[PDB]
Design an enzyme around this catalytic site. Structure first.
Site, PDB file in Angstrom:
ATOM      1  N   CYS A 247       0.808  -1.220   0.000  1.00  0.00           N
ATOM      2  CA  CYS A 247       0.000   0.000   0.000  1.00  0.00           C
ATOM      3  C   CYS A 247       0.847   1.279   0.000  1.00  0.00           C
ATOM      4  O   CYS A 247       1.696   1.488   0.879  1.00  0.00           O
ATOM      5  CB  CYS A 247      -0.999   0.013   1.173  1.00  0.00           C
ATOM      6  SG  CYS A 247      -2.315   1.243   0.933  1.00  0.00           S
TER       7      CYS A 247
ATOM      8  N   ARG B 176      -0.610   4.530   2.780  1.00  0.00           N
ATOM      9  CA  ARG B 176      -0.593   4.343   4.228  1.00  0.00           C
ATOM     10  C   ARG B 176      -0.330   5.583   5.069  1.00  0.00           C
ATOM     11  O   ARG B 176      -0.236   5.494   6.293  1.00  0.00           O
ATOM     12  CB  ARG B 176       0.404   3.245   4.605  1.00  0.00           C
ATOM     13  CG  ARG B 176       0.022   1.902   4.055  1.00  0.00           C
ATOM     14  CD  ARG B 176       0.929   0.823   4.572  1.00  0.00           C
ATOM     15  NE  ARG B 176       2.014   0.524   3.659  1.00  0.00           N
ATOM     16  CZ  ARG B 176       3.136  -0.086   4.011  1.00  0.00           C
ATOM     17  NH1 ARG B 176       3.360  -0.399   5.278  1.00  0.00           N
ATOM     18  NH2 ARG B 176       4.050  -0.333   3.094  1.00  0.00           N
TER      19      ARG B 176
ATOM     20  N   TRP C 116      -9.163   5.923  -1.783  1.00  0.00           N
ATOM     21  CA  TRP C 116      -9.338   6.577  -3.069  1.00  0.00           C
ATOM     22  C   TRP C 116      -8.284   6.114  -4.064  1.00  0.00           C
ATOM     23  O   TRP C 116      -7.282   5.510  -3.696  1.00  0.00           O
ATOM     24  CB  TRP C 116      -9.386   8.106  -2.946  1.00  0.00           C
ATOM     25  CG  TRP C 116      -8.262   8.713  -2.190  1.00  0.00           C
ATOM     26  CD1 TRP C 116      -7.028   9.038  -2.670  1.00  0.00           C
ATOM     27  CD2 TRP C 116      -8.266   9.072  -0.812  1.00  0.00           C
ATOM     28  NE1 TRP C 116      -6.256   9.575  -1.671  1.00  0.00           N
ATOM     29  CE2 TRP C 116      -6.989   9.607  -0.517  1.00  0.00           C
ATOM     30  CE3 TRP C 116      -9.223   8.995   0.206  1.00  0.00           C
ATOM     31  CZ2 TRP C 116      -6.643  10.062   0.758  1.00  0.00           C
ATOM     32  CZ3 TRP C 116      -8.880   9.449   1.473  1.00  0.00           C
ATOM     33  CH2 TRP C 116      -7.597   9.974   1.738  1.00  0.00           C
TER      34      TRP C 116
ATOM     35  N   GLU D 214      -3.504   3.708 -11.297  1.00  0.00           N
ATOM     36  CA  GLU D 214      -4.277   2.469 -11.219  1.00  0.00           C
ATOM     37  C   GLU D 214      -5.282   2.377 -12.355  1.00  0.00           C
ATOM     38  O   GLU D 214      -5.549   1.295 -12.872  1.00  0.00           O
ATOM     39  CB  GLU D 214      -5.010   2.362  -9.882  1.00  0.00           C
ATOM     40  CG  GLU D 214      -4.104   2.333  -8.665  1.00  0.00           C
ATOM     41  CD  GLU D 214      -4.890   2.202  -7.374  1.00  0.00           C
ATOM     42  OE1 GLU D 214      -5.650   1.227  -7.245  1.00  0.00           O
ATOM     43  OE2 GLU D 214      -4.758   3.072  -6.490  1.00  0.00           O
TER      44      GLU D 214
HETATM   45  C1  HEM Z   1      -6.396   6.299   1.239  1.00  0.00           C
HETATM   46  C2  HEM Z   1      -6.310   6.010  -0.084  1.00  0.00           C
HETATM   47  C3  HEM Z   1      -5.553   4.942  -0.558  1.00  0.00           C
HETATM   48  C4  HEM Z   1      -4.753   4.978  -1.646  1.00  0.00           C
HETATM   49  C5  HEM Z   1      -4.584   6.194  -2.551  1.00  0.00           C
HETATM   50  C6  HEM Z   1      -4.146   3.666  -1.792  1.00  0.00           C
HETATM   51  C7  HEM Z   1      -3.412   3.241  -2.914  1.00  0.00           C
HETATM   52  C8  HEM Z   1      -2.955   1.943  -3.116  1.00  0.00           C
HETATM   53  C9  HEM Z   1      -2.283   1.456  -4.299  1.00  0.00           C
HETATM   54  C10 HEM Z   1      -1.706   2.256  -5.453  1.00  0.00           C
HETATM   55  C11 HEM Z   1      -2.187   0.122  -4.178  1.00  0.00           C
HETATM   56  C12 HEM Z   1      -1.835  -0.855  -5.287  1.00  0.00           C
HETATM   57  C13 HEM Z   1      -3.126  -1.234  -5.995  1.00  0.00           C
HETATM   58  C14 HEM Z   1      -2.908  -2.084  -7.235  1.00  0.00           C
HETATM   59  O1  HEM Z   1      -2.085  -1.699  -8.095  1.00  0.00           O
HETATM   60  O2  HEM Z   1      -3.585  -3.125  -7.361  1.00  0.00           O
HETATM   61  C15 HEM Z   1      -2.691  -0.230  -2.873  1.00  0.00           C
HETATM   62  C16 HEM Z   1      -2.699  -1.529  -2.339  1.00  0.00           C
HETATM   63  C17 HEM Z   1      -3.238  -1.902  -1.111  1.00  0.00           C
HETATM   64  N1  HEM Z   1      -3.840  -1.027  -0.243  1.00  0.00           N
HETATM   65 FE1  HEM Z   1      -4.020   0.940  -0.391  1.00  0.00          FE
HETATM   66  N2  HEM Z   1      -4.552   2.823  -0.757  1.00  0.00           N
HETATM   67  C18 HEM Z   1      -5.478   3.588  -0.039  1.00  0.00           C
HETATM   68  C19 HEM Z   1      -6.365   3.062   0.909  1.00  0.00           C
HETATM   69  C20 HEM Z   1      -6.367   1.778   1.408  1.00  0.00           C
HETATM   70  C21 HEM Z   1      -7.181   1.315   2.518  1.00  0.00           C
HETATM   71  C22 HEM Z   1      -8.317   2.081   3.164  1.00  0.00           C
HETATM   72  C23 HEM Z   1      -6.741   0.079   2.861  1.00  0.00           C
HETATM   73  C24 HEM Z   1      -7.124  -0.823   3.863  1.00  0.00           C
HETATM   74  C25 HEM Z   1      -7.898  -0.686   4.971  1.00  0.00           C
HETATM   75  C26 HEM Z   1      -5.689  -0.205   1.914  1.00  0.00           C
HETATM   76  C27 HEM Z   1      -5.068  -1.427   1.823  1.00  0.00           C
HETATM   77  C28 HEM Z   1      -4.205  -1.828   0.813  1.00  0.00           C
HETATM   78  C29 HEM Z   1      -3.756  -3.196   0.652  1.00  0.00           C
HETATM   79  C30 HEM Z   1      -3.899  -4.370   1.623  1.00  0.00           C
HETATM   80  C31 HEM Z   1      -3.192  -3.236  -0.551  1.00  0.00           C
HETATM   81  C32 HEM Z   1      -2.722  -4.517  -1.220  1.00  0.00           C
HETATM   82  C33 HEM Z   1      -3.679  -4.863  -2.344  1.00  0.00           C
HETATM   83  C34 HEM Z   1      -3.345  -6.170  -3.019  1.00  0.00           C
HETATM   84  O3  HEM Z   1      -2.468  -6.911  -2.514  1.00  0.00           O
HETATM   85  O4  HEM Z   1      -3.969  -6.453  -4.062  1.00  0.00           O
HETATM   86  N3  HEM Z   1      -5.444   0.833   1.039  1.00  0.00           N
HETATM   87  N4  HEM Z   1      -3.188   0.897  -2.214  1.00  0.00           N
HETATM   88  N1  LIG Z   2      -6.657   2.725  -3.852  1.00  0.00           N
HETATM   89  C1  LIG Z   2      -6.732   1.434  -3.552  1.00  0.00           C
HETATM   90  N2  LIG Z   2      -6.627   1.033  -2.289  1.00  0.00           N
HETATM   91  N3  LIG Z   2      -6.883   0.542  -4.524  1.00  0.00           N
HETATM   92  C2  LIG Z   2      -6.943  -0.901  -4.315  1.00  0.00           C
HETATM   93  C3  LIG Z   2      -6.712  -1.656  -5.610  1.00  0.00           C
HETATM   94  C4  LIG Z   2      -7.589  -1.130  -6.758  1.00  0.00           C
HETATM   95  C5  LIG Z   2      -7.168  -1.703  -8.127  1.00  0.00           C
HETATM   96  N4  LIG Z   2      -5.725  -1.431  -8.356  1.00  0.00           N
HETATM   97  C6  LIG Z   2      -7.997  -1.112  -9.272  1.00  0.00           C
HETATM   98  O1  LIG Z   2      -7.383  -0.557 -10.201  1.00  0.00           O
HETATM   99  O2  LIG Z   2      -9.241  -1.152  -9.211  1.00  0.00           O
END
Ligand code: HEM
Ligand SMILES: NC(=[NH2+])NCCC[C@H](N)C(=O)O
Ligand code: HEM
Ligand SMILES: C[C@H](O)[C@H](O)[C@H]1CNc2nc(N)[nH]c(=O)c2N1
Ligand SMILES: C[C@H](O)[C@H](O)[C@H]1CNc2nc(N)[nH]c(=O)c2N1
Ligand SMILES: NC(=[NH2+])NCCC[C@H](N)C(=O)O
Ligand SMILES: [Zn+2]
Lengths: 414, 416
Positions: free
Chosen positions: A118, A121, A290, A295
């Site tokens: 993530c 974070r 968001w 993405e």
């Molecule tokens: C606040 C806005 C957030 C942004 C902008 C953000 C952005 C991202 C991005 C760029 C990735 C990679 C997604 C991909 O390419 O598939 C990611 C992965 C992830 N995010 Fe965040 N995130 C946010 C919120 C959250 C929230 C609210 C949670 C959990 C409570 C979270 C949990 C994770 C986890 C566990 C992954 C791993 C996803 C996977 O393994 O497929 N994220 N996030």
């Molecule tokens: N901002 C996030 N936490 N995204 C979670 C994964 C979303 C996914 N990469 C998509 O393109 O739909």
């Protein structure tokens, strides 16, 4: 023992001591690194034929509670050992236990904080945790999901949220959301080998039809939810249009871009991962925040096995699609991500560009270094799909490990 | 299924298993409890200097292993010549404490070390490599001649040819043959008055060193540096490469007529000269190698990196881009145009270069080839995927297994 981490852009150095707090092993060994693997069966939490041995559940439980109390700073008081014996007792008898609404709130926030992949974070401390552990039917889950969406979307001012459905029990099936995301576009496998819509969603689009869904004929048709209550066949639930905020894609300067008909939903709610807190597992706990501009712009729209529009856009821009040396691909991509950033901003919907995002991750890494003595990061995922080196994360060495609470991957319920 | 690392390609859905990794001999930076696979220099990819010859059993174990590989390559495993050579080696290590390779054994090990380099995306040409034996070299002046012969051959008038020059291996007691420079051709980095750096900030330490050893410095942004070659136990001697030898390419854009006015430029020949070549326990402290450039190495890393030329903002201003906000993707727009300039220039100057798409598309074929050949290919994902347009490139979607195979190019400490 303690990995020396260096930033090659500033020459700065830090030592990650938090990795010593890892209890779950990854896929790498000294013989070979498997860091680029999306999912080994090790980081996975597959089904089971019997209950987790008490000794283990008890230890993971004890640890979590020790973490929670250290957080609220009451580490040691009677309320701590009161809660410790309460778990020890419940486990010794029922073989399991349950979490208090406060502990669950601290658990979900910490799982996000611990998510190595993530990049968002920085916002970990701001998460709305909806307790849905009082769900018993697929109809109830649907209602819980519709509230999660309505709230998270908030007319455009998106806000992080997570609805935690009932934990898994050694004596029954799992509460599961079949879709990988609450909102996904349909993928219809046409006549030949062609695909209308999203090629990543063909399988699920088939299952919904299997369960009586009346499919559309578009590239952007929103899929119905297939919710499954324990040991019951999944249920089809069409999502209310008004709930699903979508954004029509247009370019600030390229007037013909709008004429493509491209668009994307505003809510990135992941619904196929498992949340683990204190040894307990929650097979259904959809979370959302968001989108980061890439993405959608690069991956969802430009991946060859996704919408794949690079060429369409390129020929519209009138680029030389003959040789790879004219960089038509790189050029078309930037304009697509630009169209996305422009559009979401024009529609007053929250997004964050990869530069803004990675910059925030750098500060987060710093905050975490001071807070816990390190921060688990997955370099291959943290570094954006385009302009990798143009962003600070590329030049940052990272350490990756498994800390609990954690969001894990899990098998598909079919 | 098979008890070997399963590798998947998410774009094509194809799966392969890596059996080759089973042949690895040296430990990596990773442990089950933590992945240190994003570190540039973990103490696991480095081979520290030696104040004592390698213990006769371990050196012999690598020697025997290399000989076996050699014979396996020529298809004579178990033969009379194979068993004889083995005895020849352990005989030599017995009386002297080390041994020597045969002409063909070296050509094999050198091409094998390239083949085994995780961070090279140009391994598809591993077989096509010119190995210049220079194990007869005995002086710093002879080193210069050798290097000059190398640059001439490899440059071949902008029709670059892959090559490596191997100088004498590391002998016990006797000092090493070292080229102090990081590359044969490198621009100078002048530590400015205000604190800044005119030229290339990466080369400040070496530029300071050339001056200390008698170099008369200019004050340009693109000043080719002189070589500081060192023969065993002797002080390093300064050697200036003649301008005729050092081919360079003046950068210009195919549409933006003002780009030429920027006065930017880069040298045609990429010659790493500070890496140690390890073969059968035998260490070659000096053994420069070269091939051709991949456009992003110059246009993205050399020119756009904040800690390098950092010309991103300048070009943005010239393109008239809002460098006030991140969301304008001005960094992305400029960099694409800069990379296009690098490509265009080298094409115009008829100098060899390969773009990140083509380079990457060709690494995929190399992977398929090496699958059928050795049952795998040790790749470093972070380094294989280009610094820009990562997912627009097929290697992004390719899982990779990274491990250490001998012979190999490894890092070593700086001579000073
Ligand atoms: C606040 C806005 C957030 C942004 C902008 C953000 C952005 C991202 C991005 C760029 C990735 C990679 C997604 C991909 O390419 O598939 C990611 C992965 C992830 N995010 Fe965040 N995130 C946010 C919120 C959250 C929230 C609210 C949670 C959990 C409570 C979270 C949990 C994770 C986890 C566990 C992954 C791993 C996803 C996977 O393994 O497929 N994220 N996030
Ligand atoms: N901002 C996030 N936490 N995204 C979670 C994964 C979303 C996914 N990469 C998509 O393109 O739909
Ligand atoms: C034929 C053309 C070649 C191409 C296009 C190619 C391309 C590359 C690229 C793009 C890198 C990344 C370097 C960086 O970003 O710092 C690399 C690394 C490397 N290449 Fe190649 N390569 C080629 C030839 C060679 C040759 C001839 C050798 C050796 C005989 C070689 C050995 C290596 C090694 C060991 C690295 C590691 C760099 C490091 O660790 O600093 N390459 N190559
Ligand atoms: C094989 C490789 O690990 C894979 O394609 C990864 C690379 N990095 C990624 N990074 C993010 N954020 N998301 C992804 O889906 C991927 N895919
Ligand atoms: C910290 C990180 O490993 C480092 O910045 C790497 C990333 N990938 C790279 N890839 C290539 N080709 N060259 C590099 O120098 C780097 N630097
Ligand atoms: N193609 C090569 N052999 N590259 C080796 C590394 C060169 C280095 N990245 C440079 O731009 O100077
Ligand atoms: Zn690893």
């Amino acid at each position: 023992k303690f990995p020396r981490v260096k930033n090659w852009e500033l020459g700065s150095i830090t030592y990650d001591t938090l990795c010593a707090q890892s209890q779950q092993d990854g896929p790498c060994t000294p013989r070979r690194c498997l860091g680029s693997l999306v999912l080994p069966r090790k980081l996975q939490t597959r089904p089971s034929p019997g209950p987790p041995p008490a000794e283990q559940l008890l230890s993971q439980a004890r640890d979590f509670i020790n973490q929670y109390y250290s957080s609220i700073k009451r580490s040691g008081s009677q309320a701590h050992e009161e809660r410790l014996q309460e778990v020890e007792a419940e486990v010794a008898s029922t073989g399991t236990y349950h979490l208090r609404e406060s502990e669950l709130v601290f658990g979900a926030k910490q799982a996000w904080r611990n998510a190595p992949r993530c990049v968002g974070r920085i916002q970990w401390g701001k998460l709305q945790v909806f307790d849905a552990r009082d769900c018993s039917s697929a109809q109830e889950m649907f209602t819980y999901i519709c509230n999660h969406i309505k709230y998270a979307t908030n007319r455009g001012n998106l806000r992080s949220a997570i609805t935690v459905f009932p934990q898994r029990a050694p004596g029954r099936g799992d509460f599961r959301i079949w879709n990988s995301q609450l909102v996904r576009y349909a993928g219809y496998r046409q006549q030949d080998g062609s695909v209308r819509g999203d090629p990543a969603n063909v399988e699920i689009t088939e299952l919904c039809i299997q369960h009586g869904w009346t499919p559309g004929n578009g590239r952007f048709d929103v899929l119905p939810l297939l919710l499954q209550a324990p040991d019951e066949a999944p249920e089809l639930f069409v999502l209310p249009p008004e709930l699903v905020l979508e954004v029509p894609l247009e370019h600030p300067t390229l007037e013909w871009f709008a004429a493509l008909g491209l668009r994307w939903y505003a809510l990135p709610a992941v619904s196929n991962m498992l949340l683990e807190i204190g040894g307990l597992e929650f097979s259904a706990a959809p979370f959302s925040g968001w989108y980061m501009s890439t993405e959608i712009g690069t991956r969802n729209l430009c991946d060859p096995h996704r919408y794949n529009i690079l060429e369409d856009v390129a020929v519209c821009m009138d680029l030389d699609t003959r040789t790879t040396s004219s960089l038509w691909k790189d050029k078309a991509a930037v304009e697509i991500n630009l169209a996305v950033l422009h559009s979401f901003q024009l529609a007053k919907v929250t997004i964050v560009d990869h530069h803004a995002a990675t910059v925030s991750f750098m500060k987060h890494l710093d905050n975490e270094q001071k807070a816990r003595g390190g921060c688990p990061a997955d370099w291959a995922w943290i570094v954006p799909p385009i302009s990798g080196s143009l962003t600070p994360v590329f030049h940052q060495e990272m350490v990756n490990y498994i800390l609990s609470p954690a969001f894990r991957y899990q098998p598909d319920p079919w």
